[PDB]
Amino acid sequence: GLTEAALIRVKRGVKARIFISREAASRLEHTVKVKDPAAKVSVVQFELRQSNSPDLSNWARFVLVLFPESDAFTFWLNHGDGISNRHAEFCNNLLDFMDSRCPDYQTCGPRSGDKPAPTWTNSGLEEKMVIKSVLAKCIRSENADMLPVQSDDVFLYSTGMMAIGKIARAMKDMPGDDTAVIFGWLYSGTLPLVKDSGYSKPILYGRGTEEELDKLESYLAAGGKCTVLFTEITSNPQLHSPNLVRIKNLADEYGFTVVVDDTIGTSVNLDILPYADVVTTSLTKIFNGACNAMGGSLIVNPNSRHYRRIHTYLQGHFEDLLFPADAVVLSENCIDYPERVKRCSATARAIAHFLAAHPSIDYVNYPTLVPSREEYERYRRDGEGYGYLLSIVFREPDFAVRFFDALDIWKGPSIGTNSSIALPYSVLAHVPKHIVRLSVGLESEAWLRDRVTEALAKATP
Amino acid sequence: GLTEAALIRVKRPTGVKARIFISREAASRLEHTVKVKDPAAKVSVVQFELRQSNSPDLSNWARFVLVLFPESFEEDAFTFWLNHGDGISNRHAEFCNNLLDFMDSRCYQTCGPRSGDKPLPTWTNSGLEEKMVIKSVLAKCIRSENADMLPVQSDDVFLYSTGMMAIGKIARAMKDMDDTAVIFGWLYSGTLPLVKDSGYSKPILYGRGTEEELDKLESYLAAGGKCTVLFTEITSNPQLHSPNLVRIKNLADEYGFTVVVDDTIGTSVNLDILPYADVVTTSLTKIFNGACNAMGGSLIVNPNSRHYRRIHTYLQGHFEDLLFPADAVVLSENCIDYPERVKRCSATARAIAHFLAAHPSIDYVNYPTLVPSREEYERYRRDGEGYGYLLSIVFREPDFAVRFFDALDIWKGPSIGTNSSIALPYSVLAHEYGVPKHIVRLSVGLESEAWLRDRVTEALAKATP
């Protein structure tokens, strides 16, 4: 455990976290310093010093952060700007070879300067080019009236959370301090991160609805100004579709930037390029499938009226923080990304409609069955399906609980995996409260139908 | 988790314990060990298989055996060790996990959720190329300083998945070829589990490794007692005792038994023991690798052995390659500085062993330069070579030992022979032999002597009022 091994290196009672950038580390150090100034917060960089090759030097670095063991929402500050697992292993191998600097926490490495005895080459650049190309190909619009996204309209970050924060920070440091709006995007760290980006109190329309849009449009017409709006297609966990057409009309008429997350309802399934100025994506999820690598994307629509100002910011502030091992497995697993989306989307519809028709369930959240099924159709590509995520609303919550227990599949917080996985309310607790969310995997429709059926029987008396 | 992923495939997420094995044979050992302690317990054995693959190599390795058995069953020390040897690599299990979906099962007889779909690992040819490397490094480092001694070749080396495994393979060969087996030192506590499992009706444990014990052996032999094989290990864990190999080869010659020596702790880099062992076993997991990240075991058949033809033919005629290719790779890269690492760790160890031995709040240190058997270690030490990487510490009062271990800012755990320094007490590895009970053991790593002398020192201060 690189964390354990780095507390050993600094002779240690406190608690620690590890980050890739000097920047993100101190983003946490403030949160602790505000919750308790005069608390001894320590920020130690580890760096490999004598290394001819530029690969090891650039990547064999990290920031340990010690802070009083004496944990609010920093969950999304860490889950988001943390270090990769593949990265953190890469450092634990080399931790003896690298020195520290802050105190006595300036300890040099017992084996510093020694020549180590990685697979990837060139900072995984050729594989990142592959990743950018896939994202650019799949977001291409069915509209020939539009410019294509190119691979250099695509930006890659350590995680999806990080990609989100990076666009929030650009909007704020862009000229003109106007409000940020968050539309529906909930049950995630986006509102925390948007706050960490300088938008002190954004306007949250939490339900994603047209009523909420009305309130917004009244606001804007009254003379209220707004720099950016954040939204996410096929919202978690209810599979809602925001009205991306109306949002783009409001955006054109009142001058704000539209940022959509397409993680859940994929670019394979939906054509949203025409309504978004920027498109964020978590590559950790379905794009990868395997649950083994981490990565975030950020797509700047060359059609946006804000392309020049957004691209130039992101570019002038770009640092490559996608660890190359991650980048490699990602470029590998993302080739069947459209086929896995299509397969998973097909199974999901199946058992979504299966479960919809069982007398123990009140209704199922799936784009084919939710109030906004017609909104989803405005953006659904032909011959493409209805997504891999769904959620179950049972009639009696006792039943849901017995059902979840009896369900012999993977359980946990991940989505977009090649294996189906479920999560109850015990989690996703920072919309009924006995909801059971299902991310449908690459398994046969029968196998899944089997496991669901058996679990249904176990929960009935 | 591969265990966890398998329990789901077979619809048993609760109720039972489970182990993962290589052969249905091994699975039966457990099924036997559970059925003797408790017949009527439901023991279930599922086999998992990638049946066909466009790259056949994979489907050969993507196999394993899940053994489920009731959670009320507690393993005795025996099972714990037999399962270490009958288990599968961590690298091997992760391979299988990445493929479990594509794999079918058969007792639980379900086709896999991704069966038939196309799933490539880096390694090639089952990693045969890198296992010949390993085989050669092992043969090079074991060549004796004696000029008349034949050199060990690569096809005198056999590779297996763990040091445990190797030891069993030779135990099983000597059995079926007389059933008295001798264990002369405090072995890996898996050595006796293996020779009892290998059907030796008459074992003899000499736990202290002394000449008095060697006397009891010689009297028995003259007076007519049979003996087949004798198992030993130089620089014994953890008192770093050295056995009188000269006498053991002398008894072996006078009476015709076969001598296995385990050179894991006193290395082949430091010691020339080939003149005495008919067979030499090594845990390649330990310092041979050093990185704490791959599993392997070795078995060298001395070409100078009066029993060399018989032993080699058995091990050849009964051979199966079970060394997971990804492990073989890592070993064959890391074993390049194996001799130079042994030299650096043995250098830093001797340094802080003496530092400690001169400390007033400490009785004695266990290390070959400071133990009663030092004259023995010096008989087999090579010129220019040191006194090993392991050491243990007998403090004057057990109280001090406790608060020393706690305050010592370095790695802690059962691992030895790593590139890092690691401490562990007698608290662990007790699943009586003139071994004190508050002993503290230290595998010395590649860290600087100053750095490690620092951590030792600060800990000694925190241990005094």
Ligand SMILES: CCOC(=O)CC(C)=O
């Ligand atoms: C801890 C919050 O859980 C989640 O929302 C995770 C998810 C993929 O949806």
Ligand SMILES: *N[C@@H](CCO)C(=O)O
């Ligand atoms: N998708 C999730 C991360 C899973 O733990 C989020 O941050 O919204």
